[PDB]
Amino acid sequence: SAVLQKKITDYFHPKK
Amino acid sequence: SAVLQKKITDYFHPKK
Amino acid sequence: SAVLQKKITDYFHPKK
Amino acid sequence: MFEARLVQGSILKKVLEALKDLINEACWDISSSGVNLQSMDSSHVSLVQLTLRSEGFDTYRCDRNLAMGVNLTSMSKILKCAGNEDIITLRAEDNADTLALVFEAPNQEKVSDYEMKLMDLDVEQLGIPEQEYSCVVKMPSGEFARICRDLSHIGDAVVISCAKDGVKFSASGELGNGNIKLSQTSNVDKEEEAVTIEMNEPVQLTFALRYLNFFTKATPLSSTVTLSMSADVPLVVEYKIADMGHLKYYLAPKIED
Amino acid sequence: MFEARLVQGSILKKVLEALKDLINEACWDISSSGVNLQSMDSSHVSLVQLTLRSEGFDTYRCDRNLAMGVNLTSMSKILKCAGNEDIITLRAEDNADTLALVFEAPNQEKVSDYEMKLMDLDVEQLGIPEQEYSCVVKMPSGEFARICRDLSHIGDAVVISCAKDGVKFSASGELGNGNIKLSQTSNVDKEEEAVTIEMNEPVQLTFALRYLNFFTKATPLSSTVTLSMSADVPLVVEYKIADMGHLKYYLAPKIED
Amino acid sequence: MFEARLVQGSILKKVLEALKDLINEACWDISSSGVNLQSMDSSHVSLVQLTLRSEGFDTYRCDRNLAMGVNLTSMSKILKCAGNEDIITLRAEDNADTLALVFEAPNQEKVSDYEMKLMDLDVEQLGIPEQEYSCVVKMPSGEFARICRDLSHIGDAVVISCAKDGVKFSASGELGNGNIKLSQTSNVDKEEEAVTIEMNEPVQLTFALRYLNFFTKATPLSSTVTLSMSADVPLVVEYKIADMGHLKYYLAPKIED
């Protein structure tokens, strides 16, 4: 291994 | 339109 | 007829 | 003794490709007139009928009539060992239990020589009665197979309705419904891709795509297929083998209730 | 009342294949500027955005904006009944819980009508800050997919690294390890199968190859692909849909910091 | 230090593909005289033997004899990351439990560089007497491959009869039996395609088709295959590697009690 998988939600949030 | 599958034997019969 | 598998080791022996 | 030599070996190969998935075992009736075979599938819902005329073989010989019980999977695996250009020779003694196949490459050089064990079965031949169809559609066999494959994505029965103007293939299922319509050509160019319809009255029936997709395994035998239809009778899917005979599929309808 | 026709319906087929395996349902937002799609997979690791603008269609018409919720597997199953030459029209009423897909042969009297049942969706648009990337690698699409597929056989993760002169993909596993080094085509200036890089900043990041090999279902759409990368932000893989707009896959990196 | 380079990278792909199915791991014997590999399959009924003359390579350097243990499946997956037109370079130190493969694109800037863990495993060479065979059959490799596949469907042994006239291959089973006859070609004397036999004595031996159809995985390597047969010793199946050496498959016969 070497790391862990982020989600796309940790970066893109519901539309203002 | 269909419901029951008919059979070849309901139309073609042994030849003697 | 008949027949049974021989094995390569029945023919080639080790390069001693 | 029986001996039939076929120059275009391909024909036999493709004929057996077209039967082996639907039927596993059948009786090949051999007479002076040529070769015939009739079998229902396991489910008694479809029946096949194969005519190869003696003329169509380059040599033909049938001292005594013969009813060869054959596993069509066996005969297939053998014929897969022949190449398309191979001259194929069927040969059988009169009261035999085995059927010799012989494949000879036109190159000379290669000659293959197979012998296939035969198998007892009893089969009542079914009489197929003279009958007038209300609609006979002659169309490209590729296209028929494309439609049957496609609509079996949607549903598992097709309603085929034919008229003056065109033939429509339609199915329905969980995900929703599809409706292919083929219009009786229009211009004049001949060829495949011609749809043509001999109509006496319009017809609509319903059949199970499961079985039509077995039938389309005859597509390599001809570039055109005919559909013959009449209400509450078995539809006929005919694939003519050039200068030998034809291969017919009968398929019992699904009737309202 | 929504109606969109494409003479070159291939594109619709390609989109649905580029999508069907990554996501299974998604909401197609129709408005008069065109077609928009943004959906996430089951594990919310990857996001896809599809823009086909109205001017790309041969015929476009959207009285009232729609959000139709579509089983993509259902839709692909239908779209596989279209030919690559077919002219594809999409139609749906204002409300109508159904989408019609019509396919016509340019050059044969064949017309297919499919009614796809839609589904109750309501997703919720995420918002994609629009921004500048440390690295933008434009390369041939076949090549990226070759790289993603090969390195799969090494390992589960790929590490992508970029500087001014080229990019490198690396991976590790039971077998061993491997690195592929791609260098800026110095031919360029007006070349087609090139590799060009906009590095502002060295990046080095790490992604799961599983999702990358889902994105390369998009390959048939464009000869060329672009990867935009920056330090702490999802990766964008982009395929331009010539004359209509683009498919952008977004992918959340692997990280321990 | 070992390094070899092969511009026809595809050779090394094919040879691996030719091995990976039959045997699991072997030790590559590297020396100044070139690259060698000898090993038996899971069981001890078949033996394979690979000779790669140094001068054959485009670049060869060997400082100390080297015996690299290698999981051939692992090596396969790696070589699967290499184009058929890539230049492949192998390179390893004096110890290294690593081997290094380097793939560089022909028309392109892509260079791939891999590293393979090496197994430890010892195995002693069998000694293969030089010897003159009763019957030596040179024939096209694809033919020999079709024969063994075709016959394998009829039975799981084949009886190879060799004589001045030509060579015969026979099997039998539950469904039937079969005989394929290949005559020596003289005509004018043209092309690699053709069968020439070199007889001293006729031979009729029996061998297992299971194992021959593994051997034919090498058919890509050579348009022609030689079978060298004598009574009561193993069959050799020889594929020549483009004037650089050869893959040879030795196969134990089965005889009566």
- The answer to whether the CB of F79 falls within 8 A of the CB of F101 is yes
Helix (H) or strand (E) segment spanning residue F114: strand F111-117
The length of chain C is 16
For tokens 């090969």, name the residue. E150
> Does E153 contact F111 at a Cβ distance shorter than 8 Å?
no
Round to whole Å and give the CA distance between D48 and F194: 43
Class of the domain covering E1-257 = alpha beta
Distance from the Cα of E25 to chain D's closest Cα (Å) equals 13
Tokens of E52: 């086909």
> Does B15 contact D256 at a Cβ distance shorter than 8 Å?
no
> Does C5 contact F233 at a Cβ distance shorter than 8 Å?
no
> Does E154 contact F114 at a Cβ distance shorter than 8 Å?
yes
- The answer to whether the CB of D17 falls within 8 A of the CB of D221 is no
Residue D52: strand, helix, or coil: strand
The length of chain B is 16
Distance from the Cα of B4 to chain D's closest Cα (Å) equals 6
Beta bridge partners of E235: E251
The length of chain A is 16
> Does A7 contact E129 at a Cβ distance shorter than 8 Å?
no
For tokens 């200068």, name the residue. D243
Q: Which chains pack against D, by 3+ Cβ pairs within 8 A? A: B, E, F
Phi (first) and psi of residue C10, to 5 degrees = -80, 0
Q: CA–CA distance from F220 to each of E55, F36, F216, F242 (Å)?
A: 51, 20, 9, 11
Q: F244, F220, F235: which is closest to F14 by C-alpha? A: F220
Residue D19: strand, helix, or coil: helix
Structure determined by: X-ray
Round to whole Å and give the CA distance between E220 and E132: 27
Beta bridge partners of A11: none
> Does D181 contact E78 at a Cβ distance shorter than 8 Å?
no
Helix (H) or strand (E) segment spanning residue D73: helix D72-79
- The answer to whether the CB of D135 falls within 8 A of the CB of D195 is no
> Does E176 contact F81 at a Cβ distance shorter than 8 Å?
no
DSSP secondary structure code for residue F175 in this structure: S
What single letter denotes the amino acid at residue E203?
Answer: V
Round to whole Å and give the CA distance between E216 and F117: 30
Strands E157-162, E166-173: pairing is antiparallel
Residues from chain D that touch F181, judged by Cβ atoms under 8 A, are 110-113
Residue D46: strand, helix, or coil: strand
Distance from the Cα of C5 to chain F's closest Cα (Å) equals 4
DSSP secondary structure code for residue D217 in this structure: G
For tokens 């060992």, name the residue. D81
What single letter denotes the amino acid at residue D61?
Answer: R
Nearest Cβ partner for E128 among A4, A6, A12: A12
Tokens of E163: 């500087």
Q: What is the dihedral of CA F50, F55, F57, F60, to 10 degrees?
A: 100
What single letter denotes the amino acid at residue C5?
Answer: Q
Helix (H) or strand (E) segment spanning residue F36: strand F34-40
Phi (first) and psi of residue E19, to 5 degrees = -120, -40
Distance from the Cα of F191 to chain D's closest Cα (Å) equals 14
Round to whole Å and give the CA distance between E235 and E248: 10
Residue of B nearest to D204 (CA): B1
Round to whole Å and give the CA distance between F34 and D117: 53
Round to whole Å and give the CA distance between E134 and E253: 15
End-to-end CA distance of chain F: 51
Q: Please, how many CA atoms are within 13 Å of residue E157, restricted to the half-sphere of its CB? A: 16
Give the number of other Cβ atoms within 10 Å of residue D223's Cβ. 15
Size of interface D-F (CB pairs under 8 A): 53
Tokens of E19: 């999508």
> Does E185 contact F109 at a Cβ distance shorter than 8 Å?
yes
Q: Which chains pack against B, by 3+ Cβ pairs within 8 A? A: D
DSSP secondary structure code for residue D253 in this structure: P
Beta bridge partners of E134: none
- The answer to whether the CB of B9 falls within 8 A of the CB of D250 is no
Distance from the Cα of F221 to chain E's closest Cα (Å) equals 23
- The answer to whether the CB of F124 falls within 8 A of the CB of F29 is no
> Does D116 contact F150 at a Cβ distance shorter than 8 Å?
no
Residue of E nearest to A11 (CA): E233
Round to whole Å and give the CA distance between E39 and E49: 7
Tokens of F52: 């790669």
Round to whole Å and give the CA distance between D136 and D228: 4
Q: CA–CA distance from E137 to each of E134, E182, E189, E255 (Å)?
A: 10, 10, 15, 21
Longest dimension (CA), chain B: 34
Residue of A nearest to E211 (CA): A5
Residues F66, F69, F73: CA angle, nearest 5 degrees: 135
Round to whole Å and give the CA distance between E228 and F73: 35
